[PDB]
Amino acid sequence: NATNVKAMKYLIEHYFDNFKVDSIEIIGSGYDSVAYLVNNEYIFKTKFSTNKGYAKEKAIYNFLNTNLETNVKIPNIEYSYISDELSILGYKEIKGTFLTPEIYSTMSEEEQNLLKRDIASFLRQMHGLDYTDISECTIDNKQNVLEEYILLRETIYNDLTDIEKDYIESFMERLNATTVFEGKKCLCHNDFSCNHLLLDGNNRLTGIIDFGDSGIIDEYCDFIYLLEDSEEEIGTNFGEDILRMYGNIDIEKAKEYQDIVEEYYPIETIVYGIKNIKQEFIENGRKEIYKRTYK
Ligand SMILES: NC[C@@H]1O[C@H](O[C@H]2[C@@H](O)[C@H](O[C@@H]3[C@@H](O)[C@H](N)C[C@H](N)[C@H]3O[C@H]3O[C@H](CN)[C@@H](O)[C@H](O)[C@H]3N)O[C@@H]2CO)[C@H](N)[C@@H](O)[C@@H]1O
Numbered sequence: 277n278a279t280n281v282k283a284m285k286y287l288i289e290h291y292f293d294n295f296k297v298d299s300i301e302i303i304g305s306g307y308d309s310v311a312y313l314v315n316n317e318y319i320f321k322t323k324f325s326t327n328k329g330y331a332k333e334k335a336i337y338n339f340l341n342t343n344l345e346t347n348v349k350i351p352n353i354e355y356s357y358i359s360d361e362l363s364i365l366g367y368k369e370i371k372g373t374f375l376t377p378e379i380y381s382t383m384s385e386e387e388q389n390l391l392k393r394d395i396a397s398f399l400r401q402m403h404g405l406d407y408t409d410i411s412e413c414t415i416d417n418k419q420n421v422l423e424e425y426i427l428l429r430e431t432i433y434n435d436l437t438d439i440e441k442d443y444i445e446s447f448m449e450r451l452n453a454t455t456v457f458e459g460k461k462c463l464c465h466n467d468f469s470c471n472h473l474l475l476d477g478n479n480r481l482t483g484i485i486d487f488g489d490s491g492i493i494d495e496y497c498d499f500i501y502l503l504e505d506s507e508e509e510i511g512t513n514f515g516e517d518i519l520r521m522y523g524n525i526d527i528e529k530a531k532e533y534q535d536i537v538e539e540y541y542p543i544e545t546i547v548y549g550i551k552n553i554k555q556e557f558i559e560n561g562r563k564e565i566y567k568r569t570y571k
């Protein structure tokens with residue numbers, strides 16, 4: 277804790293000429309990024325060159341702060357340093373409380389409705405943007421999967437068990453037959469889970485964070501976690517109601533999209549291990565396949 281902080285404090289003061297760090301703590305971290313709360317006021321997201329990166333995420337905040345009309349707050353980048361080896365983004369902390377299942381379950385039916393409407397409204401407004409000015413930020417999930425499958429075949433596929441091969445081939449057979457990638461494309465948050473949603477003191481949606489995976493992609497993408505059944509998310513009904521409020525979207529296909537992405541998760545986990553040379557992820561993903569096969 278103590279050492280990571282000193283180094284990042286040094287980097288921040290070094291790259292941002294007249295920035296003075298009076299206080300700094302770790303507020304979150306991914307597997308290859310670390311985020312810091314600085315002076316109790318600024319968030320600094322940092323990364324040391326991975327498979328990235330923060331350049332796109334920055335272009336997206338910039339695009340959205342220009343074009344979104346909404347009361348919902350999102351990061352607004354005041355500081356950035358972007359290089360092959362290091363990336364830093366700084367912005368003012370959005371104040372509020374993160375949505376969780378526990379909190380949601382204490383809200384009145386009406387409070388829940390208003391939150392749902394708030395979310396549907398935000399997504400409607402974002403998905404409706406003319407994305408010409410950010411048109412290079414496209415993402416083809418189907419193609420990505422096909423490329424990832426090829427990487428598997430080039431690396432470890434022949435060393436997998438039959439059970440693991442059957443799981444993978446069965447998924448690919450499903451990927452080939454589905455129609456859920458042939459629909460509307462638009463700008464999506466693309467990691468729209470409740471740990472990125474902030475509430476104000478009335479339990480209304482006040483902010484949204486981490487547009488780091490955002491891009492022009494299937495409209496169905498932004499409902500993947502809203503429809504998820506798990507300890508981390510609220511539940512399938514929450515996503516269903518939001519889809520109804522959002523309107524003009526095939527709910528059964530959104531679910532199919534979500535179900536396919538869930539099926540893919542162990543393979544994605546394996547592929548991450550291969551790409552980043554981390555055996556731990558290769559083994560986790562393979563083990564998850566056995567757990568899914570025996571449910
Ligand atoms: N940090 C990875 C970033 O997000 C995605 O990957 C993540 C995504 O697939 C999946 O993680 C997603 C998050 O993401 C999302 N924001 C919350 C959601 N509950 C979680 O869900 C996943 O993990 C849950 C528990 N743990 C499981 O219960 C759930 O079944 C599973 N789909 O697993 C990956 C790591 O958890 C992108 N594919 C990747 O390109 C990008 O770099």
Ligand SMILES: Nc1nc2c(ncn2[C@@H]2O[C@H](COP(=O)(O)OP(=O)(O)NP(=O)(O)O)[C@@H](O)[C@H]2O)c(=O)[nH]1
Nearest residue numbers: 303304305306309311319368369370371485486488
């Ligand atoms: N309250 C608050 N927390 C924030 C804000 N910005 C980031 N965070 C916190 O910092 C954590 C990490 O920020 P996030 O953008 O999700 O980055 P990440 O997923 O960890 N990194 P990456 O997007 O590169 O995979 C979030 O879970 C949340 O705790 C903000 O504006 N307000």
Ligand SMILES: [Mg+2]
Nearest residue numbers: 467472485486
């Ligand atoms: Mg995040």
Ligand SMILES: [Mg+2]
Nearest residue numbers: 467486488489
């Ligand atoms: Mg992120």
